[PDB]
Amino acid sequence: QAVVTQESALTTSPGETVTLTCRSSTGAVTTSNYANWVQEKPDHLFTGLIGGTNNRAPGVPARFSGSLIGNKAALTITGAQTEDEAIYFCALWYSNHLVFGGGTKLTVLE
Amino acid sequence: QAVVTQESALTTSPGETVTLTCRSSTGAVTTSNYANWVQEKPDHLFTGLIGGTNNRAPGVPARFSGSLIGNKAALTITGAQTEDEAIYFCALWYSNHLVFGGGTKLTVLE
Amino acid sequence: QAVVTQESALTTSPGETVTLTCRSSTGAVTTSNYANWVQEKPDHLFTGLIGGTNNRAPGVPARFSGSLIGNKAALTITGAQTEDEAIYFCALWYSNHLVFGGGTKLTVLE
Amino acid sequence: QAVVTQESALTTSPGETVTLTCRSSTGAVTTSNYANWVQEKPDHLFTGLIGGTNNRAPGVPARFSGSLIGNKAALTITGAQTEDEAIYFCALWYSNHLVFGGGTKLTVLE
């Protein structure tokens, strides 16, 4: 069955660039996986940041970008701010349903 | 039996206006439901904000107002501040006891 | 057996004065109860603020004072600051051991 | 079996100096225990601060220093900042595995 893997967390500083990755256990992530990155904030607040690999939701700066690197899907964050400190889950599409990674938690110092 | 329904959360920005709604599962919310909106803050701190549909408690700006829209009771918040970030529960009166919604959690950015 | 009762919480604003009270269920609180007020802060951080009814621990401003009002022990806080937001437990002495109230949680706005 | 003991917490103020200690229950802590101090921050964020008794990890000011005092390993913190508020665990090496103290939690006011 489909298991999604991502980093359990990444740390950083405001202004840096951090890439988060997402791999499938059934093969290469591909466009038909329509990789989504939904931001989660304390008290279970979930927000779709990017979808269809590279598509930004409304109200999302293009500092956030997504892509496919080799066989992994990636979410890159540029000019990291403090407000970005959050969990970044990867949700992949397998034909008719959604499979979620465990969520990569990104920290700033501060 | 009486089930109260409200939004599980709403997000916003300081200065905006957000309306929270409250519906009964036995019919239209009405004046004899004396709809109450009590604000809850972290560590189970509860404060009655509005009661009897449209009545403000002492120490509550008239930025907070309540009403009945059609068959729903509503709490509108105007010029949303940061300090407002909280859970907003709806408690309705059915003859001799109180039934509570699950609480609508309102967030600001920040 | 000895049950101690206090308010489950009190709210306030910086500069105000709030009194917390403490009563025994075996009679009047008295000097031989050596009423203690120990401040608790998030992550189980406990600090004895006052002891022997009216005795301040080192490093405690005399804004904090304790006493016996009638049959209740009291802790009064004057010129309430923000930093004071905490749980205030009452611990009473009964001959050879200590009995604790459930702790009064004091909030500021902010 | 190997039990590691440390203080369950220490409090302080910015600019002060606080020493944390670490003792083994099988004898004196020694160089072959390669005493490590890894900083933990809220949401299970762990960072190795010092290792091999006195060795600082990259990105760690020399405000943090470690040593062996008598039969105890010690971590001293100088010019304590606010940002330092964290749990400080001691992890000792016994031949082929690692044994952890319960973690000393250090607080500032603020």
Place this chain on the structure above:
Amino acid sequence: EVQLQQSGAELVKPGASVKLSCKASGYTFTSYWMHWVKQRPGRGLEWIGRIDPNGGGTKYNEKFKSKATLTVDKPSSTAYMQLSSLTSEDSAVYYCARMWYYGTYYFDYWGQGTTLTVSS
């Protein structure tokens, strides 16, 4: 200010009977009606009943009426809730709140809520 007071935490075991209190700064209950809100994650908030200190008159739900209970120490200023024969799901944080509707004047002020631990 005006502030309402409940105990930090109480420990009980299944089949035992415990009682929680709610005071007023205040001065006293009655009158300024009483509530008991139960909080258990996601669920958020439940209700329970009221008491008429002057001479009785509590009201709950078909489900509460067994375990439910509402009271006072009028010669002091306390309000009370009694869970007879508690269970491991009785465990929760019960809020107390006053006043009015009956309708004295004219909003509730919350307590902090007692952590009811059941049991070990």
Place this chain on the structure above:
Amino acid sequence: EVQLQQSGAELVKPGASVKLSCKASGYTFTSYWMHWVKQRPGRGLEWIGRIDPNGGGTKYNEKFKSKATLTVDKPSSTAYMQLSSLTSEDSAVYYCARMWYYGTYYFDYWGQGTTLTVSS
């Protein structure tokens, strides 16, 4: 704004059948597809299914299909999830999220999540 609404908390017991809802400000579901994310510590987030209000068409996982369920109150604007025969591990915080992919336009907005308490 645009905001999505679920209940604070719901209480149920094993073997019972409960139902959770997801509204839109919004206005209504359908269309703007529906999700249900389950959150249980470390595990973080699980999935469940969708519903086609216009006339049915839900989809889950081999494991979900028993307890799973997805629905609406189209004459209002509600979406629904039903756990039939809940268990103590059903206990969790289930998130609701909409829209699209089907692909209306063009990102999800989360709810707050209901605390499902099971049971006591």
Place this chain on the structure above:
Amino acid sequence: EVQLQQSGAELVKPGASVKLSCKASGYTFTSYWMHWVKQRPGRGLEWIGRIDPNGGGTKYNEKFKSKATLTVDKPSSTAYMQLSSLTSEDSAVYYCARMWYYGTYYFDYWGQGTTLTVSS
């Protein structure tokens, strides 16, 4: 400063016997009397006993006296609490605190508290 030290967390299983410690910066216990406060949600804070390092003299409650226990490592500076035959409700966060009343001088300073996990 002056600071008091307990272990982060300890793991035990029912029927097992565990022991928690409380040190001083400090330098040593005795003298500067010892406490053990138990914290379990709502309940908040419970008590347990004291120990007279110089040569014994502990004191608890009718309920504590079985499991209760209070001690030291005078040749070092440690104070101790022993739960013999723990249960799943022994699970909690026990605070240690010193000094005085006996009455050396003249206030308690808290530790951070050990998370007693029971059991799995």
Place this chain on the structure above:
Amino acid sequence: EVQLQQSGAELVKPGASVKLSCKASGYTFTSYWMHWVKQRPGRGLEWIGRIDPNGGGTKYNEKFKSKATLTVDKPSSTAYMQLSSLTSEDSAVYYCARMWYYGTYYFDYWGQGTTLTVSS
């Protein structure tokens, strides 16, 4: 930066066998030794073992050696921990951390830790 990656949360049931992973930004394990710290309230932090990707060589404790396990996906960059036959006390937050001692260079960087939920 340099960052280490574990899954949010994983759900398992007693008697089942689950496996947790730890990646590096990084690039790959080996070499830069591996740890697994277990966190359960008060207890705080426990240990488990290591793995020698190049060709095996794990090390744990007398108690861990049954359930314990340490591994990799060298053709990628992953490290692994396997709890065979989990129990309800296996439930916890297990941290992964690398490197060195063996002693490459010259400090650990933590992951975020997976919430292992057991079970319901």
